[PDB]
């Protein structure tokens, strides 16, 4: 049910904003795309995959898509199924001739 999914990524992520509508959080952390957990400041086993964009002729385009996969999900041997799905979502895993 795409339902809830589309809506959480919906708007931009912005940390602790004060009355003066200022951002304060020293930095805005990466968030695991398949789980929506926070990627640590020292999360050893969490990785950011870089996949490349192709252009209807077998050639490669100077354009890449990234996938953040938190630690645990990568540890439960999810990644392969996790990724293969974040790619369905961003319309890509199914690779037509």
């Amino acid at each position: 049910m795409n339902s809830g999914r589309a809506n959480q990524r919906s708007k931009p992520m912005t940390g602790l904003i004060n009355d003066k509508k200022e951002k304060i959080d020293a930095y805005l952390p990466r968030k695991c795309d398949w789980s929506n957990k926070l990627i640590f400041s020292n999360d050893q086993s969490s990785v950011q995959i870089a996949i490349a964009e192709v252009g209807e002729n077998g050639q490669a385009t100077g354009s890449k898509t990234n996938v953040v996969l938190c630690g645990s999900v990568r540890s439960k041997g999810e990644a392969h199924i996790a990724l293969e799905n974040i790619l369905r979502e961003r319309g890509l895993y199914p690779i037509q001739e």
Binding site: P12, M13, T14, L16, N18, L28, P29
Partner: protein, 230 residues
């Protein structure tokens, strides 16, 4: 030989003034492998006026023994806490033969163990992050510290031990609830530190939305990483 010879791709990027923003390093979770990596960000120009003043402090120095064939072999373990009362903290302990060496060792063990202590507000979000956004907890074998938000002024209600670690974080106001065994000072500091660290770990709503897609600083500076190494 006060020459910084990078040994990482990070120690590299940093020594050559790139990504110059410590937190930018944390965002990407770039394993702090070198000790100078931190020395870079904090300038030893000592203009004795900014809180960003990195602070190295020792806390515990203990004699540790192994018994052996008519010989009590004594060594020392020490804990150093590193921090800018501005929002970064690092705990470090090292064991060594001669004391001075443990200290300089722990000074470094403490640096690689640098963590971002997220601050926050309790109520009227006025102007400066006095507390922590939520309550967090430090675990260490059998130690339990609880960091809890507070009012302004009600500054750090903790033991002399955590208190010290807290100040070095930049946390100005928080109540603390401690559970079970504290003489184990090592475990105590580790808990405060761990707690303070778990500040970013806590997924609150005022995050929630979706991150600003970015590129790993490696795939960005790729070209460079092959210049001086060539």
């Amino acid at each position: 030989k006060n020459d910084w010879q990078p040994q990482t791709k990070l120690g590299r990027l940093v020594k050559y003034g790139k990504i110059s923003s410590l937190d930018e390093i944390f965002k990407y979770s770039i394993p702090i492998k070198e000790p100078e990596i931190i020395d870079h960000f904090y300038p030893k120009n000592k203009d004795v006026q900014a809180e960003h003043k990195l602070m190295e402090e020792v806390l515990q120095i203990t004699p540790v023994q192994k018994q052996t064939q008519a010989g009590q072999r004594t060594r020392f373990k020490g804990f150093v806490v590193v921090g800018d009362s501005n929002g970064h903290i690092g705990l470090g302990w090292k064991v060594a033969k001669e004391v001075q060496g443990a200290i300089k060792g722990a000074i470094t063990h403490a640096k690689l163990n640098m963590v971002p202590v997220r601050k926050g507000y309790w109520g009227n979000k006025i102007a400066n992050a006095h507390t922590i956004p939520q309550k967090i907890t430090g675990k260490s074998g059998s130690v339990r510290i609880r960091l809890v938000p507070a009012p302004r002024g009600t500054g750090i209600v903790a033991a002399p031990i955590p208190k010290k670690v807290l100040q070095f974080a930049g946390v100005q106001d928080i109540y603390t609830s401690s559970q079970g065994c504290t003489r184990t000072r090592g475990n105590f500091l580790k808990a405060t530190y761990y707690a303070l660290a778990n500040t970013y770990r806590y997924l609150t709503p005022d995050f929630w939305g979706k991150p600003e897609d970015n590129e790993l600083p490696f795939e960005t500076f790729s070209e460079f990483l092959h210049t001086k190494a060539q």
